Symmetry: C2
Subunit: 161 residues, 2 copies
């Protein structure tokens, strides 16, 4: 069996994940401010991680086990040009978002996903989000099980046939 | 333990499982911002082997036997529910660099660079210094690696 990644409070709120940068990377996207009227909803680079246990489970099944934790880490754009050419390059770390799939802890959320915001990296836990703030966009547009796997080529290529 | 596999000529065998290594940052040079032909199209996802990553959290240096994999991927779309920008598509190929003072003692920084003809290739191709190391030497922030673009490495090192 596999470890339980993610620690929770007695009210089932995920404590601020540490060590996620050593989980399994599944994809990176970028919404720069300048392309979104100098205020993107989520600045700017986004680096996404799934915990190792649920990555083993995904390789075997193409499905997110209960106990999946997915962390989106946000970063500024640092430059627009490099010796490799024109585009977008990351600067400093900005913040994180996370989501947890758990039928037991979250029996009445869409998909059993609890979406967590964090007010800082120094914060002890996150704040669980209403269905209008987070999960509604994810159920409408995400390709599989409310996860935007159409932007996670590690996922698509890592599921079996 | 070491994470490369080699032939007798110190040629690196096409790495398997590098997506299970430690991701250290991502950038994007789209073709539309580069005269419809980027040098390295388009998204770049960079990884360092876990053993070298452990030594980096200790020393902030690249130990001998360090392997870094840059995986390339197309721009799949330029808009999504999160807004305008660039979003990944399909996997294009890989590049790799390897640090070894004893096997590459004449390469700049003991770093051999490897190109790969496709995902199905068995071994890379090792590159002359002008093809790759020339530009890494001139411009990379640390020991030929563009750590100005790897915040996981910068946040990770012991300052
Ligand atoms: C990425 C995200 C992730 C990573 C996992 C995933 O399924 O992609 C998490 C844990 C998370 N968000 Fe998010 N979200 C949206 C899109 C399009 C992407 C991937 C593309 C990209 O990287 O830009 C996401 C969409 C939306 C959205 C539509 C406007 C809203 C309102 C939200 N998301 C809201 C939230 C959260 C509330 C603050 C929250 C904690 C999220 N998402 C977590
Ligand atoms: C990224 C790269 C990496 C990842 C580690 C790093 O040092 O960033 C590898 C293993 C690799 N490339 Fe190089 N490359 C260049 C730049 C600016 C970056 C980081 C930011 C980004 O993703 O865009 C790189 C630049 C250049 C360059 C300047 C004109 C040249 C000539 C090369 N790269 C050449 C090569 C290779 C020759 C075939 C090769 C195997 C590389 N790079 C590998």
């Amino acid at each position: 069996k596999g470890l339980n990644y993610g620690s929770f409070t007695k009210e089932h709120v995920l404590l601020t994940p540490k060590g996620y940068r050593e989980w399994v990377f599944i994809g990176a996207s970028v919404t720069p401010n300048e392309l979104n009227d100098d205020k993107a909803a989520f600045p700017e680079f986004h680096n996404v991680y799934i915990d190792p246990t649920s990555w083993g489970h995904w390789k075997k099944t193409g499905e997110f086990r209960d106990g999946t934790v997915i962390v989106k880490e946000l970063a500024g754009v640092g430059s627009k040009a490099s010796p490799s050419g024109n585009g977008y390059f990351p600067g400093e770390f900005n913040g994180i978002q996370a989501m947890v799939k758990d039928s037991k802890r979250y029996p009445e959320r869409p998909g059993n996903w609890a979406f967590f915001g964090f007010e800082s990296y120094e914060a002890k836990q996150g704040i669980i989000q209403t269905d209008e703030t987070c999960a509604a966009c994810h159920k409408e547009h995400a390709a599989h099980d409310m996860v935007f796997t159409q932007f996670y080529p590690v996922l698509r290529a890592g599921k079996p046939s």
